[PDB]
Design a protein around this ligand. Structure first.
Ligand SMILES: [Cl-]
Ligand SMILES: [Cl-]
Ligand SMILES: [Cl-]
Ligand SMILES: [Cl-]
Ligand code: NA
Ligand code: NA
Length: 129
């Protein structure tokens, strides 16, 4: 599924991401834009052989099992393919674990490099939330 900007913001708010650990909703929308262009089906290989999945590009080295990432962990206890669903519940719940892991949203390098220090509220401007 390819979400609209405000449709995704509403879904993320309904699932409790708005100000989770201090990160206002625009941070999560900005991260999703640059990680996946709001596409739940997005996949991308990393140089180490792991793969990133779904709207927030969650990686199989630590967070999910894809059966093909040797020496990895599965800390969200989910198959990576669940992160590609049109229902973003698994991606949101796993993201809550990641953002709580000590480094906040710096865990998403696209957030650090493209969203951090910018006017992230712009990403939710005009949306009925
Ligand atoms: Cl957009
Ligand atoms: Cl914030
Ligand atoms: Cl959903
Ligand atoms: Cl933090
Ligand atoms: Na915001
Ligand atoms: Na894994």
């Amino acid at each position: 599924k390819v979400f609209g900007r405000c449709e995704l913001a509403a879904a993320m708010k309904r699932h409790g991401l708005d100000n989770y650990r201090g990160y206002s909703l625009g941070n999560w929308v900005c991260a999703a834009k640059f990680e996946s262009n709001f596409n739940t089906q997005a996949t991308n290989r990393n140089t180490d052989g792991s793969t990133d999945y779904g709207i927030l590009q969650i990686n199989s080295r630590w967070w999910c099992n894809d059966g093909r990432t040797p020496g990895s962990r599965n800390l969200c206890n989910i198959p990576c393919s669940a992160l590609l669903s049109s229902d973003i519940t698994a991606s949101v719940n796993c993201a809550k674990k990641i953002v709580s892991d000590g480094n906040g949203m710096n865990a998403w390098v696209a957030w650090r490099n493209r969203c951090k220090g910018t006017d992230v509220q712009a990403w939710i401007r005009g949306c009925r939330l």
